[PDB]
């Protein structure tokens, strides 16, 4: 069931989100990553952890695929992706979902 963070509402059944009431097109993988983060609000996740968790344990592609997906998520959901208010980098560690 549905999870609210600031302007954004997550609909796990629908694999989609709305921000200020408006649909944002997310890929399955983008949604799964954002949804995973949102189940663990304010906890820093390493790229390696996010890779195996969201891409699956058999997935050994380059770990930068996590960074590429987070960038796409930021472009889609952030008012200003250079100052993210949802998905925040902890430098040299990982990413987390920054709740209010």
């Amino acid at each position: 069931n549905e999870i609210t963070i600031k302007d954004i509402v997550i609909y796990p059944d629908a694999y989609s989100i709305k921000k200020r009431g408006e649909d944002i097109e997310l890929t399955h993988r983008e949604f799964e990553l954002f949804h995973y983060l949102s189940k663990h609000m304010g906890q820093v996740m390493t790229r390696e952890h996010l890779l195996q968790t969201v891409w699956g344990y058999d997935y050994f592609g380059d770990v930068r695929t996590v960074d590429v997906t987070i960038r796409r998520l930021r472009e889609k959901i952030e008012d200003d992706p250079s100052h993210p208010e949802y998905i925040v980098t902890r430098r040299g560690v990982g990413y987390f979902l920054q709740q209010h």
Side-chain angles (χ1 to χ4, degrees):
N1 216 196
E2 55 158 72
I3 305 170
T4 305
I5 175 50
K6 295 177 193 179
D7 285 340
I8 289 185
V9 186
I10 305 159
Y11 301 93
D13 284 5
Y15 293 81
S16 67
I17 68 170
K18 301 192 197 164
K19 170 183 206 185
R20 293 190 286 258
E22 298 140 43
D23 296 338
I24 293 187
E25 281 191 338
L26 294 192
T27 79
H28 182 88
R29 198 80 87 195
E30 283 162 2
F31 175 87
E32 287 297 292
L33 181 49
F34 185 65
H35 187 215
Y36 183 73
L37 288 183
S38 86
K39 278 181 283 205
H40 294 109
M41 267 170 280
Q43 300 166 14
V44 189
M45 310 291 196
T46 67
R47 297 186 299 158
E48 297 69 10
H49 177 83
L50 287 172
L51 190 70
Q52 60 190 82
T53 298
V54 166
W55 280 256
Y57 293 100
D58 270 30
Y59 191 91
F60 298 94
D62 189 331
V63 81
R64 290 285 195 188
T65 195
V66 172
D67 300 325
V68 168
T69 297
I70 290 279
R71 183 182 180 83
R72 296 297 292 132
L73 272 171
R74 288 159 167 179
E75 290 168 339
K76 288 174 180 193
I77 82 176
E78 296 282 356
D79 284 341
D80 174 4
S82 61
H83 284 97
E85 82 187 304
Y86 300 87
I87 299 159
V88 180
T89 297
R90 172 54 60 63
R91 73 182 271 85
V93 186
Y95 301 98
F96 62 103
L97 185 31
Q98 163 89 92
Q99 194 190 224
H100 43 192

